[PDB]
Write an enzyme that holds these catalytic residues in place. Structure first.
Site, PDB file in Angstrom:
ATOM      1  N   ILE A  32      -7.516  -0.414   9.791  1.00 43.45           N
ATOM      2  CA  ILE A  32      -8.749   0.410   9.862  1.00 43.45           C
ATOM      3  C   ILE A  32      -9.864  -0.199   9.004  1.00 43.45           C
ATOM      4  O   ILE A  32      -9.376  -1.197   7.936  1.00 43.45           O
ATOM      5  CB  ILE A  32      -8.229   1.996   9.180  1.00 43.45           C
ATOM      6  CG1 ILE A  32      -7.932   1.907   7.875  1.00 43.45           C
ATOM      7  CG2 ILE A  32      -7.138   2.443  10.168  1.00 43.45           C
ATOM      8  CD1 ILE A  32      -7.628   3.340   7.255  1.00 43.45           C
ATOM      9  N   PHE A  35       1.832   9.697   3.124  1.00 42.18           N
ATOM     10  CA  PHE A  35       1.843   9.668   4.534  1.00 42.18           C
ATOM     11  C   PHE A  35       2.578   8.252   4.820  1.00 42.18           C
ATOM     12  O   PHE A  35       2.987   7.864   6.323  1.00 42.18           O
ATOM     13  CB  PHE A  35       1.006   9.963   5.599  1.00 42.18           C
ATOM     14  CG  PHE A  35      -0.274   9.031   5.286  1.00 42.18           C
ATOM     15  CD1 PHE A  35      -1.160   9.161   4.343  1.00 42.18           C
ATOM     16  CD2 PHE A  35      -0.573   7.836   6.315  1.00 42.18           C
ATOM     17  CE1 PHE A  35      -1.988   8.008   4.295  1.00 42.18           C
ATOM     18  CE2 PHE A  35      -1.383   7.206   6.155  1.00 42.18           C
ATOM     19  CZ  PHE A  35      -2.345   7.167   5.278  1.00 42.18           C
ATOM     20  N   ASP A  36       2.700   7.391   3.911  1.00 44.06           N
ATOM     21  CA  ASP A  36       2.850   5.873   4.486  1.00 44.06           C
ATOM     22  C   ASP A  36       3.296   4.967   2.861  1.00 44.06           C
ATOM     23  O   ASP A  36       2.514   5.308   1.958  1.00 44.06           O
ATOM     24  CB  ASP A  36       1.925   5.189   5.154  1.00 44.06           C
ATOM     25  CG  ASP A  36       2.756   3.951   5.971  1.00 44.06           C
ATOM     26  OD1 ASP A  36       3.888   3.728   5.631  1.00 44.06           O
ATOM     27  OD2 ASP A  36       1.875   3.175   6.355  1.00 44.06           O
ATOM     28  N   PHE A  64      -5.668   5.137  -0.534  1.00 46.58           N
ATOM     29  CA  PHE A  64      -4.551   4.134  -0.718  1.00 46.58           C
ATOM     30  C   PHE A  64      -4.326   3.537  -1.864  1.00 46.58           C
ATOM     31  O   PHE A  64      -5.192   3.108  -2.786  1.00 46.58           O
ATOM     32  CB  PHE A  64      -5.040   3.072   0.458  1.00 46.58           C
ATOM     33  CG  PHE A  64      -4.824   3.464   1.696  1.00 46.58           C
ATOM     34  CD1 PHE A  64      -3.753   3.254   2.624  1.00 46.58           C
ATOM     35  CD2 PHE A  64      -6.135   4.027   2.216  1.00 46.58           C
ATOM     36  CE1 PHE A  64      -3.505   3.765   3.720  1.00 46.58           C
ATOM     37  CE2 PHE A  64      -6.033   4.392   3.766  1.00 46.58           C
ATOM     38  CZ  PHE A  64      -4.862   4.306   4.431  1.00 46.58           C
ATOM     39  N   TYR A 102       0.839  -1.149   0.033  1.00 49.56           N
ATOM     40  CA  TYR A 102       0.048  -0.287   0.020  1.00 49.56           C
ATOM     41  C   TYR A 102       0.899   1.126   0.060  1.00 49.56           C
ATOM     42  O   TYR A 102       1.904   1.051   0.682  1.00 49.56           O
ATOM     43  CB  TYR A 102      -1.062   0.222   1.258  1.00 49.56           C
ATOM     44  CG  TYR A 102      -0.215   0.297   2.484  1.00 49.56           C
ATOM     45  CD1 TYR A 102       0.020   1.438   2.933  1.00 49.56           C
ATOM     46  CD2 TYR A 102       0.393  -0.940   3.515  1.00 49.56           C
ATOM     47  CE1 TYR A 102       0.554   1.743   4.186  1.00 49.56           C
ATOM     48  CE2 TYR A 102       0.997  -0.820   4.474  1.00 49.56           C
ATOM     49  CZ  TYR A 102       1.072   0.583   4.854  1.00 49.56           C
ATOM     50  OH  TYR A 102       1.798   0.657   6.298  1.00 49.56           O
ATOM     51  N   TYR A 118      -9.560   6.299  10.710  1.00 53.03           N
ATOM     52  CA  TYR A 118      -9.169   7.186  12.004  1.00 53.03           C
ATOM     53  C   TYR A 118     -10.072   8.110  12.423  1.00 53.03           C
ATOM     54  O   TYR A 118      -9.445   8.827  13.407  1.00 53.03           O
ATOM     55  CB  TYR A 118      -7.722   7.948  11.389  1.00 53.03           C
ATOM     56  CG  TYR A 118      -6.442   7.232  11.839  1.00 53.03           C
ATOM     57  CD1 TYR A 118      -6.206   6.549  12.934  1.00 53.03           C
ATOM     58  CD2 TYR A 118      -5.746   6.462  10.818  1.00 53.03           C
ATOM     59  CE1 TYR A 118      -4.960   5.904  12.942  1.00 53.03           C
ATOM     60  CE2 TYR A 118      -4.742   5.588  10.746  1.00 53.03           C
ATOM     61  CZ  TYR A 118      -4.459   5.447  11.948  1.00 53.03           C
ATOM     62  OH  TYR A 118      -3.181   4.589  12.259  1.00 53.03           O
TER      63      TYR A 118
END
Lengths: 263, 434, 592, 186, 107
Positions: E56, E36-37, E99, E26, E82
């Site tokens: 999540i 962010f990731d 994502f 991902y 979140y």
């Protein structure tokens, strides 16, 4: 010619640097001269290291590693400032130490690792950061005091090692004496455990140390408890609650093993 | 003056205060670095003794009172209106000198910085004003560095105000240093302040500069310089193809870039306009280029998802057919013969268009320009003429880099000056009027 | 180079390339400019595309003054030509913009009341064209970051625009989106009554509905016909294009009108609920200019192109990957390669202090903050900073510090705290330990050997944010330690080989920036104990080839090192001595 | 360089003289080097005197005399290992009544007008311990009960007889050879 | 509340169930465009088991709907990503997450 040894290599290199250039950095100067002294005084390294050397049985390796990790977690708390999460970490870290069997079987190892000094330093940090403003985080201070008293009771040598810190504890005697439900968990209780039932330590106890307690008791007999009158207790001129703790400590100082220490 | 007395009645020793403040600054001036160690230590000891005597006689509260009574006036104009024109002229200077004096009185003295803890909260309350921002920041930095007790009173509100100072006054490394001192002091880390600074500054991603790795993207185009103009012998409809022999979705951690379409040139210069010569940009990243990537139509660095039969990012063995109509500005795409359901319209036509492909590492694309050079797999739509038909008779159709510079030895690399305009590409007959 | 001119510049990195050096210059003693450089000299050229930058105070043509807002006056930024009425004055249109954008909503929806002011998102600013400034030469509106046009003749027809029309499978256009970088109107045409600029200064007021993306303009109290619709997430910069026909050109007014919240509320997040207009120092006028430089990349993508056949068409192939680390300015919606900060001193210093703040917030075992920072600074970025040979010294020294603090500092300090206390199990593997490896009483290489003393555990947690459990905050984030070790050894070897010649181009600009951060990372890895046997032998040979050869080249000890490098080398030697002492203690316990 | 570092550290103003292992080691090394130590002839006795003078010159030519004064001054009258080894180094460089060292010490004091040196000297004299009969009685009672003595010599009684002897030996060497100037200056 | 947009087709017959460890890469990003990731930045695939809220809920539902070997874009609203408290230090409050997820392998 060939140095063939790290010792000779360092001894040549530090001197070569120093004679080649005038070193401007005092930290560098200290570093090189510390290295040179270490190379020349090899036996001193052994003299310093062997007291910190301990041998354990193979079966105890896992428990010793767990206890070492717990001690490291407690030690790292010195670098951080006191807080709620640090209090929780300190509490369960001490709990693991009590639960570990190596703590009892190898008291010499624990004294060499110097856990009691670390716990003392954490308690000093708290009493600096909240002695006069009423003891903040009282639960962790109570846990530290209980741990130190148990340390005294584990072995007689630990009792002497703890007694060596008596002077500071007696100065921080007035921490939580007037607050009940914390009895047995104040630095005065730790001092009593330090000088409890040991004739050698009772004799070694000095007169100024007793004078501090006498002065505290005089203050408690002259002036009332500010925190109690803040809570609204009727104001009598003197403080019984604080005075009784000092009386107990004096009792433990003067009376030992059924005998009365005349001195 | 605040009680509204006449200026003549008011005795306001402005010049004397300014000169005395200068003398005090000189008195508390720190030792210089050129000094020998012993002399430097003597000056340091003298300054420490002076600070101790001043604070023991309570000169800090007097400076604080002067500063507070001076901030009641919003600006120099307001202070001049209240007292007089000299007062207005010297008001800012007096404030700055007072703040410098406070910083000099508390600098390097742990006792003074500890006694300043009570006033720290009042100090941070004027950090927003441009009249005192630098001085207050310097005083706060000195106090935080010197006194551990200072950190214990800094709460969420003060940290939030310090952070908002970055948002309001722009980037300033002094605020960053104050925030750093709010994290670790004298080898001790305050976890509450660390957490608050993190959670209040980092997640926004609006103040601190952001960093990221971007794959290098190159652009490739043929020689043809398609254009549109009034009374010009040029054909308004054009068509070409690109087949992706091979493409790796992830050569690196970032997704592989592969986009195809048309690009224009600002004016009649042969140099593509509106985009960076080198970087991570490509087709569709500016308002001069028009791209398709299999899922998105790309223009102005904006991607719009476009429907298509069997939607997919450009894969191995995919044929993309691009059609351009300059009569009515229209760029259309067809994937594998199926028609893409989106098109560009009404774009600026005051330039020269040309096919273009933008890519990152991991491509094996092939230009099918029609005719002899390339063989179209799908027949061109009616009207549209294959792109090889725009080559000038003398010139030869070849595929070259869109930008001038390319990978080669530095001493061999050709530095190019500005290119000449290519107005001759559009042959508009201009007959002499008779 | 002028129009259609081609030239090559030889700095003489390879002296043989210089064609006329021998006959003139060599015997005279002039040296090639790149005589002692191991890296290609970075080249900076004149930027073709103009960019917006803040108006300099020393600018000889444009002056900007900030008028504070009184109780009855809104804040004002007044743009005037100081060079007006003087020789060499420029009669050219200038493009001014505000330094910060209004951001439209991510998704568009399908006495004034204070609650209405609180719930509304419409923002307002105004432009007062000073009387006598020809408003036909003045344009007011919004622009985006893409605006890079400096045509001396500006008109609303030349603005770049496109219309993406998306239709269904049948072909019916279900939606059409107009996209343009410029959304402005002209005051001359906005003079619907005519001579509005004559009697008083003309006021164009721009209102933007951030919730719906509608841009509308009001002149002299009536809403003008021209209106714009922008797509969601657009950042619009207030902008004025003006050709100065008077000493005073125009004035940005940051006031507010009925039911519209002022511009500062939209710009700043702190004042999102503050009806009072504000002009904080961050907001400032920026004018389009060409005075900027541009750095050519040291390396470009290798692409090969060729006509395969008549049927096959042309082939364009690229198979080698390259990356550059881009630094994004948030307020300007810009992006520059981080190596471009070698000449932008202010950004370099601010980013170095930002890196220091990143280290400080996660300093001393703040594992949760380290996990959070792994999002902002990824391990590919960290490794690229590890390896890059053109990075500025400050950024190099900050990025190695981050790589140490986020991943390695906790275990390193645990090992350092447990260093001086030797707890050794008494087991069969411990029994084998001896002071000397063989009969010949020759010291073994320090570190290499079998050590059985108890050592703290090394445990790391994967930093993933899709996961929900908080226990992953415990333990320092994981890093590719093997790759890091290999790169550290490689770079140390290359640095020693390069510094053995004292090149004029050290990595980071100075020998300190080249060595102190590298040796710091190397020492941290050694303290943690990642290095094993053969790698330890290679690094010891790098330290000193003579002493540590297993039984010409100069090790780091005798390369005339700076003092900061000497200090870390002293630390390394201290670690080696500590290893020797631990080996001795274990041998004594084995004999015991 | 080593002596200059040790002098700078002493001259830097701190509230208390921090214990330094480096000084603890190198002051001892220098003190042992000076002495570097049954009838003997006149020639060999004079040779030993000349060798001792050269070994003392090796240090006092490089600021050792000034450093051993600065450290005592920074001690601020607090008995500790640092001053205990500074006194030993001073004695080592002053053995035999070294007139050059005495003159250097007096000149440095007169030039710098150091009052802290004499204040620290008085503080150390006050801090010097003496026989304590109460401690002796407690020690005897401990032996009578039968606990094994940690220290066999009763180090609690007469806490540091080496430090007191070293201090007064230093003060005597400061005046040996009938140094009237330093005698009056004391 | 999760939207799926296929970038690359999958097999179309195998979908994740109970008891199966899903292995994905991902490249999660915010709506504005900032990443962010990335499990591909970390160079290790992410393994998570279905139905026990390791991840999540938006990610869970998106991976459930996705098939083997299929790359898809997952748009997750804050209510499934979140919430409104956000992730302290990483994800701001009330932020939709995009994502890029590839389902590599299933056991």
């Amino acid at each position: 010619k060939k140095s063939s040894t790290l010792q000779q290599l360092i001894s040549e290199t530090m001197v070569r640097w120093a004679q080649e250039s005038v070193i401007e950095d005092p930290e560098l100067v200290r570093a090189m001269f510390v290295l040179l002294h270490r190379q020349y005084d090899g036996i001193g390294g052994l003299v310093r290291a062997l007291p910190k050397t301990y041998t354990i049985n193979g079966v105890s390796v896992e428990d010793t590693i767990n206890l070492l990790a717990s001690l490291g977690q407690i030690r790292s708390l010195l670098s951080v400032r006191m807080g709620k999460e640090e209090e929780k970490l300190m509490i369960r870290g001490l709990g693991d130490i009590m639960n570990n069997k190596v703590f009892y079987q190898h008291p010499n190892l624990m004294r060499a690792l110097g856990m009691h000094e670390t716990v003392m330093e954490v308690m000093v940090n708290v009493l600096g950061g909240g002695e006069s403003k009423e003891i903040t985080f009282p639960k962790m201070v109570a846990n530290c005091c209980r741990f130190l008293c148990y340390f005294c009771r584990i072995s007689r040598q630990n009792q002497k090692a703890m007694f060596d810190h008596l002077s500071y504890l007696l100065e921080n005697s007035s921490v939580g004496l007037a607050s009940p439900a914390m009895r047995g968990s104040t630095p005065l209780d730790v001092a009593a455990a330090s000088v409890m039932d040991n004739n050698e330590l009772a004799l070694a106890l000095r007169e100024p140390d007793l004078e501090k307690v006498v002065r505290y008791l005089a203050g408690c007999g002259l002036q009332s408890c500010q925190m109690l009158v803040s809570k609204g207790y009727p104001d009598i001129g003197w403080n019984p609650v604080e005075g009784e703790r000092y009386l107990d400590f004096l009792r433990f100082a003067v009376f030992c093993n059924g005998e009365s220490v005349e001195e | 003056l605040s009680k509204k007395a006449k200026a003549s009645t008011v005795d306001l020793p402005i010049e004397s205060v300014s000169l005395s403040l200068q003398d005090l600054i000189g008195y508390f001036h720190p030792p210089d670095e050129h000094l020998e160690h012993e002399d430097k230590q003597n000056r340091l000891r003298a300054l420490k003794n002076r600070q101790n005597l001043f604070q023991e006689e309570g000169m800090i509260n007097l400076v604080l009172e002067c500063i507070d009574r001076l901030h009641v006036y919003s600006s120099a104009a307001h202070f001049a209106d209240v007292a007089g024109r000299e007062a207005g002229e010297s008001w800012k200077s007096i404030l700055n000198s007072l703040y410098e004096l406070l910083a000099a009185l508390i600098r390097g003295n742990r006792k003074n910085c500890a006694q300043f803890s009570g006033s720290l909260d009042w100090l941070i309350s004027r950090l927003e004003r441009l009249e005192a921002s630098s001085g207050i920041l310097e005083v706060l930095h000195c106090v935080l560095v010197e006194s551990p007790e200072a950190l214990n009173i800094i709460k969420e509100g003060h940290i939030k105000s310090i952070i908002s100072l970055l948002d309001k006054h722009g980037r300033n490394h002094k605020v960053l240093d104050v925030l750093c001192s709010l994290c670790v002091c004298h080898g001790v880390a305050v976890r509450s302040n660390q957490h608050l600074i993190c959670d209040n500054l980092l997640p926004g991603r609006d103040l601190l500069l952001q960093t990221r790795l971007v794959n290098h993207v190159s652009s490739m185009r043929p020689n043809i310089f398609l254009g549109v103009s009034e009374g010009s012998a040029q054909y308004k409809k054009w068509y070409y193809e690109l087949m992706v022999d091979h493409t790796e979705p992830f050569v690196t951690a970032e997704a592989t870039h592969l986009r195809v379409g048309w690009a224009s040139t600002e004016g009649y210069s042969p140099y593509p306009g509106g985009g960076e010569e080198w970087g991570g940009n490509g087709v569709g990243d500016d308002l001069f280029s028009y791209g398709f990537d299999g899922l998105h139509l790309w223009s102005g660095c904006i991607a719009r998802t476009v429907s298509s039969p069997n939607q997919h990012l450009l894969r191995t063995d995919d044929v993309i057919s691009c059609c351009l109509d300059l009569s009515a500005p229209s760029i259309s795409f067809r994937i594998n013969g199926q028609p893409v359901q989106g098109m560009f319209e009404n774009f600026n036509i005051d330039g020269l268009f040309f096919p273009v492909v933008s890519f990152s590492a991991g491509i094996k694309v092939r230009f099918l320009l029609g005719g002899r050079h390339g063989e179209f797999k799908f027949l061109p739509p009616p009207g549209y003429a294959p792109c090889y038909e725009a080559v000038l008779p003398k010139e030869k159709l070849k595929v070259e880099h869109s930008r001038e510079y390319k990978q080669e030895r530095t001493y061999t690399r050709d530095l190019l000056g500005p290119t000449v305009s290519l107005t001759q590409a559009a042959f508009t007959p201009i007959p002499v009027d008779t | 180079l002028g129009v259609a001119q081609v030239g090559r510049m030889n700095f003489g990195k390879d002296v043989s390339t210089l064609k006329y050096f021998t006959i003139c210059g060599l015997q005279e003693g002039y040296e090639p400019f790149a005589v002692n450089t191991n890296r290609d000299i970075t080249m900076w050229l004149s930027k073709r595309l103009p960019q917006f930058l803040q108006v300099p105070s020393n600018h000889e043509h444009i002056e900007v003054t900030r008028i504070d807002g009184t109780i009855d006056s809104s804040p004002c930024l007044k743009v005037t030509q100081k060079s007006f009425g003087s020789q060499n004055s420029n009669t050219d249109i200038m493009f001014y913009r505000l330094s910060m954008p209004i951001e439209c909503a991510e998704v568009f929806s399908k006495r004034d009341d204070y609650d209405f002011l609180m719930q509304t998102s419409t923002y307002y600013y105004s432009v007062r064209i000073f009387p006598g400034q020809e408003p036909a030469n003045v344009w007011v509106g919004w622009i985006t970051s893409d605006f890079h046009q400096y045509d001396t003749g500006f008109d609303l027809d030349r603005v770049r625009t496109v219309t993406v029309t998306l239709g269904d499978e049948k072909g019916k256009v279900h939606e059409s989106i107009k996209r343009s970088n410029c959304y402005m109107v002209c005051a001359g045409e906005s003079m619907s009554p005519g001579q509005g600029r004559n009697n008083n200064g003309l006021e164009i007021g721009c209102v933007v509905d951030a919730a719906s993306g509608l841009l509308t303009f009001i002149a002299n109290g009536k809403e003008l016909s021209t209106y714009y619709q922008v797509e969601p997430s657009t950042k619009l910069f207030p902008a004025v294009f003006a050709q100065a026909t008077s000493p005073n050109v125009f004035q940005f007014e940051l006031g507010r009108i009925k039911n519209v919240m002022p511009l500062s509320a939209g710009l700043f997040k702190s004042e999102h609920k503050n009806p009072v207009p504000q002009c904080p120092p961050r907001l400032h006028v920026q004018f389009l200019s060409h005075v900027l430089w541009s750095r050519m990349p040291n390396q470009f993508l290798k692409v090969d192109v060729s006509r395969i056949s008549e049927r096959q068409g042309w082939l364009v192939q690229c198979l080698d990957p390259l990356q550059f680390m881009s630094l994004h300015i948030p307020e300007e919606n810009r992006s520059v390669d981080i190596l471009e900060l070698t000449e932008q001193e202010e950004l370099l210093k601010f980013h170095y202090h930002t890196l220091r703040l990143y280290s400080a917030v996660c300093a001393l075992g703040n594992h949760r903050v380290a996990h959070a920072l792994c999002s902002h600074v990824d391990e590919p970025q960290l490794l690229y900073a590890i390896e890059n040979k053109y990075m500025p010294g400050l950024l190099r020294a900050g990025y190695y510090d981050l790589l140490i603090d986020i991943h390695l500092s906790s275990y390193a300090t645990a090992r350092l705290m447990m260093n001086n206390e030797y707890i050794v199990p008494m087991t069969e593997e411990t029994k084998s330990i001896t002071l000397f490896p063989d009969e010949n009483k020759k010291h073994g290489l320090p570190g290499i050997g079998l050590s059985t003393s108890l050592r703290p555990r090394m445990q790391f947690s994967s930093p993933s944010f899709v996961s929900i459990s908080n226990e992953c905050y415990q333990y320092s984030p994981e890093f590719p330690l093997d790759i890091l070790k290999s790169k550290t050894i490689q770079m140390l070897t290359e640095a020693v080989k390069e510094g053995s010649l004292h090149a004029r181009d050290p990595v980071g600009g100075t020998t300190e920036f080249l060595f102190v951060p590298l040796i710091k990372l190397f020492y941290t890895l050694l303290i943690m104990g990642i290095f094993h046997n053969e790698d330890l032998k290679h690094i010891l040979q790098l330290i000193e080839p003579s002493v540590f050869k297993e039984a010409p080249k100069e090790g780091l000890l005798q390369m005339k090192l700076p003092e900061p490098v000497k200090l870390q080398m002293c630390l390394l030697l201290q670690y080696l001595c500590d290893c020797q002492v631990r080996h001795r203690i274990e041998a004594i316990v084995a004999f015991s | 360089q080593l002596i200059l570092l040790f002098s700078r550290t002493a001259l830097t103003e701190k509230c208390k003289l921090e214990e330094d292992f480096l000084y603890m080691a190198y002051a001892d090394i220098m003190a042992k080097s000076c002495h570097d130590e049954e009838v003997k002839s006149f020639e060999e006795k004079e040779m030993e005197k000349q060798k001792l003078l050269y070994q003392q010159a090796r240090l006092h030519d490089r600021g050792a005399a000034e450093m051993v004064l600065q450290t005592i001054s920074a001690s601020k009258g607090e008995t500790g290992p640092m001053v205990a080894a500074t006194l030993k180094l001073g004695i080592a460089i002053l053995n035999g009544g070294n007139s050059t060292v005495q003159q250097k010490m007096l000149d440095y004091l007169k030039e710098k007008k150091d009052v802290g040196f004499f204040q620290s000297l008085a503080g150390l004299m006050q801090s010097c311990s003496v026989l304590d009969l109460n401690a002796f009685e407690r020690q005897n009672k401990a032996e009578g009960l039968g606990m094994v003595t940690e220290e066999g010599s009763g180090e609690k009684v007469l806490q540091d007889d080496e430090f007191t002897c070293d201090l007064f030996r230093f003060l005597q060497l400061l005046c040996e050879g009938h140094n009237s100037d330093f005698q009056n200056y004391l | 509340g999760v939207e799926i947009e296929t970038i690359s087709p999958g097999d179309g017959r195998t979908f994740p169930k109970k008891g199966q460890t899903c292995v994905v890469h991902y490249t999660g990003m915010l709506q504005n465009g900032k990443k962010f990731d990335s499990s591909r930045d970390r160079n290790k695939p992410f393994k998570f088991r279905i139905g026990k809220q390791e991840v999540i809920k938006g990610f869970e539902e998106g991976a459930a709907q996705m098939s083997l070997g299929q790359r898809a874009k997952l748009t997750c609203t804050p209510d499934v990503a979140y919430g409104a408290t956000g992730h302290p230090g990483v994800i701001p409050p009330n932020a939709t997450l995009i994502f890029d997820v590839e389902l590599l392998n299933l056991e």
